[PDB]
Write a protein that binds this ligand. Structure first.
Ligand SMILES: [Cu+2]
Ligand SMILES: [Cu+2]
Length: 311
């Protein structure tokens, strides 16, 4: 180990379980706001279940950490600048740690599945370093996360419903601009227990709803400029066949000089809502996406709370 840690990358914990220690290789952030990434292949090829996490952040410097599963990490080197990519394939978020917005534990009996036919072969870890002290550009850092994996089949499988907005432009100086996303849901029940929101600097607030016969149930609402942890859903919201998932990101064009495209162009703005759910294992899938607004009509009736600043 690069920071003198004696823990191996795998530690068997009893007959069916093991821990993976996923730790940066002695990296030295030389600048403030640096995103380093690394990858860790699953040691088993059979499917396995991620049931628990323990963060190992340098509290001096580490702002947030994210952990993804995927099959095509963006590099095969010991580490890399995450601005290069996370994975060149889809990157399925498993965990977020933020310094001033502490993670919530997985519900009991809930586990993400990895490996096997359908599951991620690799973890990719992102460690974002905030403002760093001068006089630290020979300090080696091994921040990351310890993952509890089991090969015991879990009764509930966690996954991610990803809502993204790609059809909306922000005109310069326009005070408030909404980006609405909506998709009909057509699987077996999922039950949303957490969420995380992401825009860049123009995002004001992001809110997620289940709409069922024209009644809206909040999934969750957060300002994207607060720490983008997974915020817990106090009472898990069941979403079933026939519901619509609806989301609204509120943006500002204030202070801008040209129009800002939200989504693709991989340019300037985006709006992503990470809806973390579990499904009864036999009906489960690990992820779903919504990238459209099938029912723009609906937003005329949106609850007024969806529009309230969270400054
Ligand atoms: Cu951060
Ligand atoms: Cu982004």
């Amino acid at each position: 180990n690069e920071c003198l840690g004696t823990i191996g990358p795998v530690t068997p914990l009893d007959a069916s379980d093991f821990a993976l220690d996923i730790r940066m290789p002695g990296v030295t952030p030389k600048e403030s706001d640096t995103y380093f990434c690394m990858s860790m292949r699953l040691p088993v090829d059979e499917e396995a279940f991620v049931i628990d996490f323990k963060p190992r952040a340098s509290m001096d410097t580490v702002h947030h950490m994210l952990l993804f599963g995927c099959n095509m990490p963006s590099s095969t080197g010991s580490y890399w600048f995450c601005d290069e990519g996370t994975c060149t394939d889809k990157a399925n978020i498993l965990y977020a740690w933020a310094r001033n917005a502490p993670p919530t534990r997985l519900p009991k009996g809930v586990g993400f599945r990895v490996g096997g036919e359908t599951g991620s072969k690799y973890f990719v870890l992102q460690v974002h370093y905030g403002d760093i002290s001068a006089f630290r550009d020979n300090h080696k850092d091994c921040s990351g996360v310890s993952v509890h994996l089991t090969r015991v089949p879990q009764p509930l499988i966690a996954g991610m419903y990803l809502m993204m907005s790609v059809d909306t432009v922000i005109p310069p100086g326009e005070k408030v601009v909404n980006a609405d996303i909506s998709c009909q849901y057509k699987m077996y029940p999922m039950h949303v227990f957490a969420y995380r929101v992401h825009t860049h600097h123009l995002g004001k607030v992001v809110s997620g709803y289940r709409v069922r016969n024209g009644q809206w149930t909040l999934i969750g609402r957060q300002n994207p400029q607060l720490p983008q942890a997974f915020y817990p859903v106090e009472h898990p919201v069941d979403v079933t066949f026939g519901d619509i998932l609806a989301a609204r990101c509120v943006f500002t064009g204030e202070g801008r000089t040209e129009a800002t495209h939200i989504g693709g162009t991989s340019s300037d703005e985006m709006c992503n809502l990470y809806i973390m759910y579990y499904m009864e294992a036999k009906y489960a899938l690990s992820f779903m996406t919504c990238t459209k607004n099938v029912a723009p009509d609906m937003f005329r009736t949106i609850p007024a709370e969806a529009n309230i600043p969270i400054p």
